[PDB]
Symmetry: D2
C-alpha cells in the first residue's frame, strides 16, 4: 500500500529513511546512515509491489542508495531487498548488499551483506 | 566508463537489461528476465556512484525491479548490487537479492541470493 | 574460547544447536531445526578461531548441516557464518546460506540467505 | 557424482581445495587461498547431502575454514554453500560468507559475500 510505506522510518543503527511510495510502484526519498563513510542525506530510488496479496503477506520492495552526495563520495552503493509488514507496528525487514568500486584484483571482497529492520515513526 | 553503462546488456541467463544512466547518478530502464514467474518487461530504477575514483576501479551501482507489470504480479522484488567495469570488454558484475512477500511463517525463507554478470554481447 | 561456545543454544525460530568446541578450532554437534523439511537431529561440523583477539571482538566461526539423517533427506545443506560474543548474555550472530541440489536450469534459485541469532542456555 | 567430490579442485582465484568425501556425508581436507590475509593451508570440514536425488540434480554441500593456522590468524571464518555437479566437466558452484570478528561498533560490516566456482582444471 503506498500510504503505509510512505513516512519516516529508522533502523537499529539509528539511520533515517524518508520515503514516498507512488501509485505506479515507485519509491523516492532520502537516506541518512548512522555509520560508514556517509554524511548528510543521500538520494534513494526503489520499487515496491503496488498490488501485494489478501492476506497477511508482506509487500516486497527494494531500493538503492549510491553513497555520493555534494559533501561525500564513498564510491559504493547499497541495495536493500525486503518486505513491508503493516499493522500497528509496521516494519520493513531487509537484507542488504553494499558493493564498493574496486580494482579487478580486490573484486572478490567488494561486497558486504547485512540486514536491517526499520520501524516507522511518521508518514 | 560510467556513461557507458547506458546500453543494452544481457546476462548469462539471457535476461536483457536496458539502462539509461543520467549525469547525476540515476539509472532508469527496463528489465526482461529469461527465468522465473515473469513475462515481458518490468520497470527498473537505480543509482550509480557518478564520480568513480585513478584509479582503475569499477563504478559501484545497484537497481531494483518489482516483478509486477500489466501481465504478471509475482509479489517479489529483486535488487542487484555490483560494479561496472568498462574497457574493450565491459561488464557489470553483480550479486542480487530476490525477496518474495510471505506470511511471517515463511519469512525465514523469503530471500534468494545469486550473482549475474552482464555484457553487451 | 571453546568453553564459551560449547553448550546448548536456541535461535529465534526455536531451533536447537548443541555444540562442543575442541582445542584445535573444531566444532561438532547436532542441530534440530524448527522449520523446513527437517525432522530430528542432524550432524553439524564447523571451525572457529581458537585464538580470537583482547579485546571485546567476537570470535569468528561457521558450521554446516547437510539436511539428511536416517529419517529425512531434504537434498540441501546450510552453512552459518557469524561470531560468538560472550558476556553474561552470550550470543552467536549469524547469516546463513541454504543451498538445495537442483537441475542446471533452476540453479539460479538454489540459494536462500537469512540470519539467525542464538542465545545460550547450557554448557 | 558425490564420491567424485574427492579430489583437488581449484577456483577462479587460483585457490586450491583438497577434499575427501566420506560415505556418510562428511567432508575433510585443506584449503589454500590465493587471496587475502592467508598463507599456506588451513583445515576445512563440511558436510554434503550422501544420497542426492533421478533426477539430474547436483549434490548440495558446504564447508568452513577458520583462517587460523600455525602461520596466520586472520580472525575470520568463511563458509561455502553450493552444489557439486559431475559429468565430463565437473564443478562445484558456491556462494560464500566471510565473517571477521569485530567489536560491536563494526559488526554491521563484518560479513563479505561472494561466489566461487571450482573445477579440477
Ligand atoms: O543504515 C545502514 N545500514 C547499513 N548498510 C549500509 O550500506 N550501510 C549501513 N547503514
Ligand atoms: O536475470 C535474472 N536474474 C535472476 N534474479 C532474479 O531475480 N531473477 C532472475 N533473472
Ligand atoms: O534454524 C533454522 N535456521 C534456518 N536456516 C536453515 O537453513 N533452516 C532454518 N532453520
Ligand atoms: O578462494 C577464495 N575464495 C574467497 N573467499 C574467501 O573467504 N577468501 C577468498 N579465497
Amino acid at each position: 500500500a503506498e500510504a503505509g510505506i510512505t513516512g519516516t522510518w529508522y533502523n537499529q543503527l539509528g539511520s533515517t529513511f524518508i520515503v514516498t511510495a507512488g501509485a505506479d510502484g515507485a519509491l523516492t526519498g532520502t537516506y541518512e546512515s548512522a555509520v560508514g563513510n556517509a554524511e548528510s542525506r543521500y538520494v534513494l530510488t526503489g520499487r515496491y509491489d503496488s498490488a501485494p496479496a489478501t492476506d497477511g503477506s508482506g509487500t516486497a520492495l527494494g531500493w538503492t542508495v549510491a553513497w555520493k552526495n555534494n559533501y561525500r563520495n564513498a564510491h559504493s552503493a547499497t541495495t536493500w531487498s525486503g518486505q513491508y509488514v503493516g499493522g500497528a507496528e509496521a516494519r520493513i525487514n531487509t537484507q542488504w548488499l553494499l558493493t564498493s568500486g574496486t580494482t579487478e584484483a580486490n573484486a572478490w571482497k567488494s561486497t558486504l551483506v547485512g540486514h536491517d529492520t526499520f520501524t516507522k515513526v511518521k508518514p
